[PDB]
Amino acid sequence: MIQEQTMLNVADNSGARRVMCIKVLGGSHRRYAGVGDIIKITIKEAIPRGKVKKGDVLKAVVVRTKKGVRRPDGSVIRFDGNACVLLNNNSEQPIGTRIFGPVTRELRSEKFMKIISLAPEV
Amino acid sequence: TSKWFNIDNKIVDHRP
Amino acid sequence: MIGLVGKKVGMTRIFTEDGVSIPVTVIEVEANRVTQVKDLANDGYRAIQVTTGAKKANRVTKPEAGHFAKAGVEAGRGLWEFRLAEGEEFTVGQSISVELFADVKKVDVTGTSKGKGFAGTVKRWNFRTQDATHGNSLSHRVPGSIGQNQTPGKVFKGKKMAGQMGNERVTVQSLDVVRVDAERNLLLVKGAVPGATGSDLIVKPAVKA
Amino acid sequence: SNIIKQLEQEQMKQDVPSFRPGDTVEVKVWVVEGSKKRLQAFEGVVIAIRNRGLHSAFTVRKISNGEGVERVFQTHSPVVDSISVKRRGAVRKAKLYYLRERTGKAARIKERLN
Amino acid sequence: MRHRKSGRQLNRNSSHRQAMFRNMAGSLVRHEIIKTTLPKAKELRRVVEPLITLAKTDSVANRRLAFARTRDNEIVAKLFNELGPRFASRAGGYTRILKCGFRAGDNAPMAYIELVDRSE
Amino acid sequence: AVQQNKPTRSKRGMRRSHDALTAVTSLSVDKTSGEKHLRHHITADGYYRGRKVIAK
RNA sequence: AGGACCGAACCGACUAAUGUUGAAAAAUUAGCGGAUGACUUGUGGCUGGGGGUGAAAGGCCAAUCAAACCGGGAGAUAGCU
RNA sequence: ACACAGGUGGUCAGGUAGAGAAUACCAAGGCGCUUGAGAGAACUCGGGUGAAGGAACUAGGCAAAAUGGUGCCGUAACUUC
RNA sequence: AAUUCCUUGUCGGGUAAGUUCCGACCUGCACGAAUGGCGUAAUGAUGGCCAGGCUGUCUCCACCCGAGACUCAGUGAAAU
RNA sequence: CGAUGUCGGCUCAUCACAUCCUGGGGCUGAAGUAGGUCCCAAGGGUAUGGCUGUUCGCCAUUUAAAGUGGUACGCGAGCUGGGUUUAGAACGUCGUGAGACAGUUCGGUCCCUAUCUGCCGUGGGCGCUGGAGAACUGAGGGGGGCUGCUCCUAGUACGAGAGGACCGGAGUGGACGCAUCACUGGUGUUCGGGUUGUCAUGCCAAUGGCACUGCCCGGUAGCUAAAUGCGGAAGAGAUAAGUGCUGAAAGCAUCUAAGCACGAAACUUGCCCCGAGAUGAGUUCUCCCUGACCCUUUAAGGGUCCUGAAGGAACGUUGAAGACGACGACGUUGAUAGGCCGGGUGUGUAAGCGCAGCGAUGCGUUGAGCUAACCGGUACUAAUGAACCGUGAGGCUUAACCU
Ligand SMILES: N[C@@H](Cc1c[nH]c2ccccc12)C(=O)O
Ligand SMILES: [Mg+2]
Ligand SMILES: [Mg+2]
Ligand SMILES: [Mg+2]
Ligand SMILES: [Mg+2]
Ligand SMILES: [Mg+2]
Ligand SMILES: [Mg+2]
Ligand SMILES: [Mg+2]
Ligand SMILES: [Mg+2]
Ligand SMILES: [Mg+2]
Ligand SMILES: [Mg+2]
Ligand SMILES: [Mg+2]
Ligand SMILES: [Mg+2]
Ligand SMILES: [Mg+2]
Ligand SMILES: [Mg+2]
Ligand SMILES: [Mg+2]
Ligand SMILES: [Mg+2]
Ligand SMILES: [Mg+2]
Ligand SMILES: [Mg+2]
Ligand SMILES: [Mg+2]
Ligand SMILES: [Mg+2]
Ligand SMILES: [Mg+2]
Ligand SMILES: [Mg+2]
């Protein structure tokens, strides 16, 4: 459950550190993004070197939500915090090159393969 | 005497 | 085709080999015994009339009893009609088991919704709630304007307003049939049907694809 | 719930060992990895438990690669397969939600050893 | 909205209620009859009859519990010595509610509640 | 919010079509003592269903 | 030492909700300011109506104020209703 | 104008904790406020808790929420020091 | 600008985006020196703007505890 | 003018169509993708933010789209009170001045218990022609009607390239809607525990009150959304613009004058719900009543004794039904509620006693003790024998059967 405003941590290099969701893309009036959805983003923190700089506007992939995820059977995965992987505005597709912290099976997408190939877990 | 709304200016003045 | 009358015992999962939780409402479906058949001759239409439960003798009235008398009695909870359509059934308490749905994939299901009794707007109609704050004077869950001005000079009919909510008919439709179990009188349909535990239910094969 | 119950216990696992909040269990869950149907191990602290027959679940807290992750297994689910206890926890407290506010060295729980 | 709820409110708060049915349990176990409004009477049962049951087994503990409720050593005493054994064999329903009806001052619907073997 | 016309004497009456009271009929007799009483209620004397409970 | 500081009594009246045929013709509740001073308070005194008093708002002078109240001229006058 | 949640100067002042005439629980003493009894709807008033989010509300963070003690360590621009 | 109509002037800053705000320019419709000019530490229930914390203010409302609202008994108003 | 409250927001709407999106078309300077324009179409859908009082507008970022209008520029006896607009104050400005400004600037109380109409709900009465219990028929009314993206068709048609389809499939979404608590969770002041201050139960030990439930950690049922099921359809009829077939008037041509075929989220249906006060009061099944007698102005006439049914209501215990009525379950030939038994769930190892320890405390007995609304059971208590209402064969006419 991510929604406009809401700070997210970032799970890649690129160098964002802290980032804010300025839109839940994908539908009129769409309230929440979560799981492995896409959101428009404005960088709030940014390391000094880094691909991205503060004030940039990009997209990103929700990779960990505290409300977590369910899928079949009835179980739950919850993560302590909210994190995402920055995507280039045109091509989706991570601008980063390393992923940090575990990611979930749901992300097993054509476009998000590069994330689960990286990333040390689930 | 008079009810408070009648005495009060904002409600009473209403259309100048 | 026709359908049957049951009783919501209700709601539990069943797990599958490849590890998936299927939430199911558990409908107990004791045999339905046709109390009457109806025909274009004895005017109107083609329908059957079943009963299903069991009732206290001292509770069954003379008339109700006399009606049960024609055909195999044992008075049940109540009566229900199903319209027919080129299927046929003779009245001698024909008795219809959950057998009926062995091959059915669909099923519609109709209960009597839990009784909310009031609600008013917000609950009843999902009306928005006025500023909780910011100066609002005694108008936090109220309905706000309910008309225009002189020119309609009235409130239109069917205006969404506070009042009775639930404890009414409502059916659900679609609903995959998960399991059929005769000599147990069970029927597991996938998930959630209207009305409370214990209440009466009518299930029919779904009218929609 | 008399006609239920029956439907339910005829699905319940019987091999499930006994654990207790605080224990450091490892749950080995099935996972269609991608092409392979393999086992995957989740090891962490039991922080809360169910106790509702067929619907029994429990929450295991892991602290992976920085910050925690919690998994609620429905205990009687096929996808679980194996579950062994691996360490005995001393807590006195049914739900260990307080651990969420701790971090590493501050979140260790004594052996129960009895 | 009350579906399947249990426990009357008697236009008090939890605190007031708790203390009142305490004073009343006493007043019943003591006098063995009291006059009270039918609602108040019916609820009294769910307080008293458990106590009597509890007393059917004498121990230090069971007394000390019967004292954390009621809080009057005279009544934890009358139970256990008298009412405990006096009903040691009775399934439940140690009381019965008899209705006289309609108090003068306020038209309140009224009733007697007695221990069932009062006899005396 | 206030009337614009005096409601009539007629209208008043109408509104009161339902305000009228019901008797009892369900008045019943004790099997031991004579005693009229409300059903399921103690009698004046303290009888109820033949038995004498309450001395008062 | 202090028109010094934090803060009850005491003196104030910045915000809000309630109340608006009130519990109350101006208050209640939660917060708020001052609190050894140009402070605050009991009793008693003096100032009178184009006059008083006013750290000044046309404020206050007995629930009355760009001229108090009571009686009088008096049945003012009213090309208006 | 009321058996009116208001106004009314002086005097006395116990225990436990506390800096305290704050505050909480008590003593001496004094009270339960002159309609009650049931119901456990909408709505209104006054409170409590809330998944994920955290000012996106709105004229405005209005209101709520938060801060809150004592000792020690430590504390920027600027400064009439 | 408590003064600027034209005006959301223009440039710089802050924001993903700023008719407000901070810094400037000077074209001051219509500042200006005790009906004082320009500054100013400290003070302010003073006006405007920003951020951290905080949260039912909001997304979007859920449940709960109390006082009314509802039912019975007694008393018994109001404006129009 | 003996008062017709006013910009903007909020809440709730409702119509029009000069249609923003979705649908169907003609023309195109229509290759394709995609546009333009006109025609038909009002079924549904039709953005969150920055700034400002704004509406608006600009900007950011979405979306299939972010439609134009009417409704006292809809909506203050629904809310707000930021703007204009009360008494205070200042700036610039005008004025000798009091003062003044569509100049600006900081600060200020929006009352009304709903009689009527209307509207959302819910009962009472009588009717419907003997009375009564059910189940129905369905005139009629309301509800619903949105849409993205990916994959296959197919890198095919088309195109020098770049690019890239119709038509037809398959999944999976957004917003919306109905239902439900199995899962995941919120609440859970009626369950358990921890803990501060203090008072009390004589004291130790153990407990209770008060402090917001004193503060707080968990949490049963119920109620619930963020939770999880389901829905919009397919089909059929008659059409809109439009396209046709055949075809004269008019030897030809022509969709039309006769005749025939296509044709859209609009229309009538299909789906869901209400529904015989449908006074045009309908249908079907079942149950109940088979006594005497008098008076007059002698007739759907009035009355007396007997009789009191089917059923209903009342009362009682009551419910996932409920404001009150209402609706459902049950009343001893009984599980209706409480209690009680067993279980579960929650909490998390009671008290007592022992051991260790100087003690705080730890351990053993002990996963103990306690445990609401849950589950399965159980007549211990309370649901009385009765009374009450309701009757005693049910109008005239004509027709058809039979006597
Ligand atoms: N108390 C009044 C205010 C008020 C009292 N007297 C007045 C005279 C005139 C105007 C207002 C008032 C209120 O409800 O706000
Ligand atoms: Mg007010
Ligand atoms: Mg309010
Ligand atoms: Mg009109
Ligand atoms: Mg029960
Ligand atoms: Mg308390
Ligand atoms: Mg001072
Ligand atoms: Mg001070
Ligand atoms: Mg005065
Ligand atoms: Mg005169
Ligand atoms: Mg004269
Ligand atoms: Mg008094
Ligand atoms: Mg007084
Ligand atoms: Mg005090
Ligand atoms: Mg009083
Ligand atoms: Mg009362
Ligand atoms: Mg929250
Ligand atoms: Mg801001
Ligand atoms: Mg807004
Ligand atoms: Mg804003
Ligand atoms: Mg504040
Ligand atoms: Mg607070
Ligand atoms: Mg300035």
Ligand SMILES: [Mg+2]
């Ligand atoms: Mg001058």
Ligand SMILES: [Mg+2]
């Ligand atoms: Mg000052």
Ligand SMILES: [Mg+2]
């Ligand atoms: Mg009354």
Ligand SMILES: [Mg+2]
């Ligand atoms: Mg008027």
Ligand SMILES: [Mg+2]
């Ligand atoms: Mg048109």
Ligand SMILES: [Mg+2]
């Ligand atoms: Mg208007």
Ligand SMILES: [Mg+2]
């Ligand atoms: Mg203003």
Ligand SMILES: [Mg+2]
């Ligand atoms: Mg190519």
Ligand SMILES: [Mg+2]
């Ligand atoms: Mg080619």
Ligand SMILES: [Mg+2]
């Ligand atoms: Mg002690």
